[PDB]
Design a protein around this ligand. Structure first.
Ligand SMILES: [Mg+2]
Ligand SMILES: [Mg+2]
Ligand SMILES: [Mg+2]
Ligand SMILES: [Mg+2]
Ligand SMILES: [Mg+2]
Ligand SMILES: [Mg+2]
Ligand SMILES: [Mg+2]
Ligand SMILES: [Mg+2]
Ligand SMILES: [Mg+2]
Ligand SMILES: [Mg+2]
Ligand SMILES: [Mg+2]
Ligand SMILES: [Mg+2]
Ligand SMILES: [Mg+2]
Ligand SMILES: [Mg+2]
Ligand SMILES: [Mg+2]
Ligand SMILES: [Mg+2]
Ligand SMILES: [Mg+2]
Ligand SMILES: [Mg+2]
Ligand SMILES: [Mg+2]
Ligand SMILES: [Mg+2]
Ligand SMILES: [Mg+2]
Ligand SMILES: [Mg+2]
Ligand SMILES: [Mg+2]
Ligand SMILES: [Mg+2]
Ligand SMILES: [Mg+2]
Ligand SMILES: [Mg+2]
Ligand SMILES: [Mg+2]
Ligand SMILES: [Mg+2]
Ligand SMILES: [Mg+2]
Ligand SMILES: [Mg+2]
Ligand SMILES: [Mg+2]
Ligand SMILES: [Mg+2]
Ligand SMILES: [Mg+2]
Ligand SMILES: [Mg+2]
Ligand SMILES: [Mg+2]
Ligand SMILES: [Mg+2]
Ligand SMILES: [Mg+2]
Ligand SMILES: [Mg+2]
Ligand SMILES: [Mg+2]
Ligand SMILES: [Mg+2]
Ligand SMILES: [Mg+2]
Ligand SMILES: [Mg+2]
Ligand SMILES: [Mg+2]
Ligand SMILES: [Mg+2]
Ligand SMILES: [Mg+2]
Ligand SMILES: [Mg+2]
Ligand SMILES: [Mg+2]
Ligand SMILES: [Zn+2]
Lengths: 275, 32, 88, 115, 96, 65
RNA sequence: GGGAGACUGGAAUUCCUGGUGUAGCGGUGGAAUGCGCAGAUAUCAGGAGGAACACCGGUGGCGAAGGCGGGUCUCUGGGCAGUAACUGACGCUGAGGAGCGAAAGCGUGGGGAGCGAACAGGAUUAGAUACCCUGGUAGUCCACGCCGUAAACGGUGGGUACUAGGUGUGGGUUUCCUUCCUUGGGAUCCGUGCCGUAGCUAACGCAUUAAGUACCCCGCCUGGGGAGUACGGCCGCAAGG
């Protein structure tokens, strides 16, 4: 649910926060948490690779399962739904009948006290995982594998979904979340359903702190920059830069995808904006 | 029975509506 | 709608004697039972505006009958109020 | 290719007419239309264009060796009888005549009227 | 406690002899709950007017049951959850 | 105006089972004839319409084959 | 076709996947912008999604007025006829007040197949900011709140008793030619159409469903414009009433 704050202070007017009506617990399994440290936006050399990113809050990482091939044909029951900062969508805790405990992304519409079948011939209940060869055409999926045994590497953020079109030969055509069409080997695995927590878009923050805590720093504009530091800089007053807009390393906008890529001569079509 | 009276009333109402639409901004500035 | 069994037991319990059916006491008892049941219905069903019209008609009839009972007598009116647990 | 039994598909709109000869399984062999015959604009709607299209399609089908066809017709009537008669005269024979016109069951919304 | 009539269509792949035990085990739930009465008649293997679920033939069975609304809704959901059934219709035999 | 066969006390019952009875009241295009042609009363006409269209739903009559 | 909730049915348009297939397809009184030779239209199979339910269906039924029709299940309001067991004048009206109230419009959040204000082009005209053609954003849909207005018309307020007939139609009870099947015939109560006397009306027309002869209560009008406008006040986030 979405909760809206009643205005009582100038900085809090219009702010919002997601009402956690789907959470059950606030304590991850001690046996599955692993440590993590703030990288700070630098790299091995010490330089800043990406500007205006840093600061934040000491987060702990949860190990997620993105293979789902080791355990097959064994049912599992959903235990709890838990908060996860590292990724947008919520996560769920599973108890396998053999006793092992595991984490997975929480699909939309799931709830406590439910049975998830992960077999290669499992049912079409949302949350099941099975190879595309066995999945009927037209259904919706998420967490798709790019190549067999490669791990879930697509459609993971909140509100996203992929639609599976018909089949032919050894390839299946998938609608990307942004309108593209891509082929993939049918041997790979996928999951049925859509990721939950679709109400992320409506969040309105309203306060510079709610961004600084998440770890985004000021942006500083180009036209205010000095001429030496930025190509747009300089000028008496404020000006549009006196030159076509350009990134602050000299290279202008336009083409960005390296041609002759091994997928260039095999993939179908590109994105279209605002049709 | 006829239509002339209705047409006249319609014309007057249209003129008044157009005047209000055009003067909206001045009305708002004066009132507020 | 009320059926024969509950209608008969209400009449037997609230009537002045074993043959009256049109007595104001029986009228009020039947009306209040109907209102209770149908209000319970509208508790779950929200947008039945025709049923709301039914509520209004039944409430008006009950109020008017109670007014007549008050006009004819006072002790009977008070006894009916206390027995049915209403306010007016 | 060679097919003894085939099917004929004819549709006639208010300003065009297209005819195609197809196998019983649905595959097409040859097709003809007024545009291919060589008529442009409003001249395309005359029944004579439909007759020429039907004759050309029948000839091209007889080239592949089609003996009998079944006619499926649809659309508002412009050159129905003329096309059927031209197909008859072209040297082919029809088994059955079936009228299958798409009739919506009060779906969608038609475009507004003309003034 | 009202009279109901139920018609169920079964796919032709099933055997004629095996259907009746399936119906009995389906209606056992009603029989054990509301102390109901029922009568079962079977007559099938007839061509269908139009293609359904990529099938052309089917089995028609008519059932008469006297049970509660909740029990009949239970039966309906249980049947429709099955994969060997095609269609189900339930209606009252009385005036309403 | 011809006579309504169902107002009689000897008239047969109407339901979505009698395939021939339902067929006799529909045109070979698969549609329902008008009450003016049929000659039956309003109640029986509606009962016949409901029965035929229920049978059509339960797949015993074609959708205008 | 009185209302609400749940489940579910097929046709059709669009889109997408996969075969057949060759250069056109769409369009108007006549032509052009448009989509194709990177494979269109057409045709066959499969899939996805949204809205509405031909034939029954009509000057027919229901609701106080707006309005109401794909099927099945659950809850629920009102009316009509008969017997007449019961209460025993408890009836009508209703200033202010409260409730319901077509389509458009506004706030929050979803969904978006078709249609389509605003806006682009194409065409006609001396000028087209239009009628015509190709595209298309709000909106039309759903949930929760708003505003409360229409030729919201039978241009005819509510209740009651009386005043020649005739002919269709819906619903329910009765009796006789009697097959007793039967728009065979007769009596009675309610609803809905058309033609007609006495009567009324300036005339058009109304005529047992009165604009007739009568009684009770409420609203409204006193020459056309100025004006349903100005000021004040109430309501509303805004349009505005
Ligand atoms: Mg660590
Ligand atoms: Mg170094
Ligand atoms: Mg940045
Ligand atoms: Mg620090
Ligand atoms: Mg997250
Ligand atoms: Mg703030
Ligand atoms: Mg900046
Ligand atoms: Mg500076
Ligand atoms: Mg400076
Ligand atoms: Mg420097
Ligand atoms: Mg420089
Ligand atoms: Mg400079
Ligand atoms: Mg400067
Ligand atoms: Mg300057
Ligand atoms: Mg500038
Ligand atoms: Mg630039
Ligand atoms: Mg003037
Ligand atoms: Mg034309
Ligand atoms: Mg058009
Ligand atoms: Mg009936
Ligand atoms: Mg609803
Ligand atoms: Mg194709
Ligand atoms: Mg096609
Ligand atoms: Mg009822
Ligand atoms: Mg008496
Ligand atoms: Mg008043
Ligand atoms: Mg209201
Ligand atoms: Mg609206
Ligand atoms: Mg607006
Ligand atoms: Mg809106
Ligand atoms: Mg919106
Ligand atoms: Mg779409
Ligand atoms: Mg223009
Ligand atoms: Mg359009
Ligand atoms: Mg008005
Ligand atoms: Mg109206
Ligand atoms: Mg009067
Ligand atoms: Mg009458
Ligand atoms: Mg006279
Ligand atoms: Mg006169
Ligand atoms: Mg008259
Ligand atoms: Mg009258
Ligand atoms: Mg007068
Ligand atoms: Mg004056
Ligand atoms: Mg005025
Ligand atoms: Mg005013
Ligand atoms: Mg004022
Ligand atoms: Zn009859």
């Amino acid at each position: 649910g979405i909760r809206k704050y009643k205005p009582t202070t100038p900085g809090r007017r219009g702010a919002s926060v997601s009402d956690f009506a789907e959470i059950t617990r606030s304590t991850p399994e001690k046996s599955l948490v692993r440590p993590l440290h703030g990288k700070g936006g630098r790299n091995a050399h010490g330089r800043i690779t990406t500007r205006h990113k840093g600061g934040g809050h000491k987060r702990a990482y949860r190990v997620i399962d993105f293979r789902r091939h080791d355990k097959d044909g064994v049912n599992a029951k959903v235990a709890h739904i838990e908060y996860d900062p590292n990724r947008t969508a919520n996560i769920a805790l599973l108890h396998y009948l053999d006793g092992e405990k595991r984490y997975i992304i929480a699909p939309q519409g799931l709830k406590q006290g439910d049975v998830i079948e992960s077999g290669a011939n499992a049912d079409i209940k949302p949350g099941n995982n099975l190879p595309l060869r066995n999945i009927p055409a037209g259904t919706v999926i998420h967490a798709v594998e790019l190549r067999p045994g490669g791990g879930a590497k697509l459609a993971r953020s909140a509100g996203v979904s992929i639609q599976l079109l018909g089949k032919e030969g050894t390839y299946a055509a998938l609608r990307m979340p942004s309108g593209e069409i891509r082929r993939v080997d049918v041997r790979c695995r996928a999951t049925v359903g859509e990721v939950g927590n679709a109400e992320q878009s409506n969040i309105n923050w309203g306060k510079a702190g709610r961004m600084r805590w998440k770890g985004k720093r000021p942006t500083v504009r180009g036209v205010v920059m000095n001429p030496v530091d930025h190509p747009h800089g300089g000028g008496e007053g404020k000006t549009s830069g006196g030159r076509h807009p350009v990134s602050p390393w000299g290279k202008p906008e336009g083409r960005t995808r390296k041609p002759n890529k091994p997928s260039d001569k095999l993939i179908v079509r590109r994105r279209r904006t605002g049709k | 029975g006829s239509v002339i009276k209705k047409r006249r009333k319609r014309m007057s109402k249209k003129k008044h509506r157009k005047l209000l639409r055009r003067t909206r901004v001045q009305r708002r500035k004066l009132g507020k | 709608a009320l059926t024969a069994e509950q209608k008969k037991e209400i009449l037997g319990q609230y009537g002045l004697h074993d043959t009256d059916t049109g007595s104001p006491e029986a009228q009020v008892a039947l009306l209040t039972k109907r209102i209770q049941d149908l209000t319970e219905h509208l508790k779950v069903h929200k947008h039945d505006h025709h049923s709301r019209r039914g509520l209004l008609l039944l409430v008006g009839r009950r109020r008017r009958l109670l007014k007549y009972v008050a006009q004819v007598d006072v002790a009977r009116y008070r006894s009916l109020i206390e027995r049915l647990g209403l306010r007016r | 290719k060679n097919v003894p039994h085939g099917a004929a598909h004819i549709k006639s709109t208010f300003n065009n007419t297209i005819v195609s000869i197809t196998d019983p399984q649905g595959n097409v062999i040859a097709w003809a239309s007024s545009g291919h015959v060589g008529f442009k604009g409003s001249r395309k709607s005359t029944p004579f264009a439909a007759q020429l299209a039907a004759e050309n399609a029948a000839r091209k089908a007889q080239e592949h060796g089609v003996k009998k066809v079944d006619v499926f017709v649809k659309g508002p009537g412009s050159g129905r009888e003329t096309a059927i008669r031209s197909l008859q005269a072209a040297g082919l024979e029809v088994g059955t005549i079936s009228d299958v016109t798409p009739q919506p069951h009060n779906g969608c919304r038609p475009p507004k009227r003309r003034r | 406690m009202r009279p109901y009539e139920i018609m169920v269509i079964l796919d032709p792949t099933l055997d004629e002899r095996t259907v009746a035990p399936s119906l009995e085990t389906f209606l056992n739930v009603i029989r054990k709950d509301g102390g109901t009465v029922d009568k079962v008649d079977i007559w099938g293997r007839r061509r269908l007017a139009y293609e359904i679920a990529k099938h052309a033939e089917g089995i028609y069975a008519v059932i008469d049951v006297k049970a509660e609304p909740a029990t009949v809704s239970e039966l309906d959901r249980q049947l429709n959850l099955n994969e060997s059934v095609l269609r189900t219709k339930v209606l009252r035999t009385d005036k309403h | 105006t011809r006579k309504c066969v169902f107002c009689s006390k000897k008239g047969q019952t109407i339901d979505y089972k009698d395939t021939a009875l339902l067929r006799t009241y529909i045109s070979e295009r698969g549609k329902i004839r008008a009450r003016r042609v049929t000659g039956n009363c309003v109640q029986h006409q509606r009962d016949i319409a409901v029965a035929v269209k229920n049978a059509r739903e339960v797949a015993l009559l074609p959708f205008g084959s």
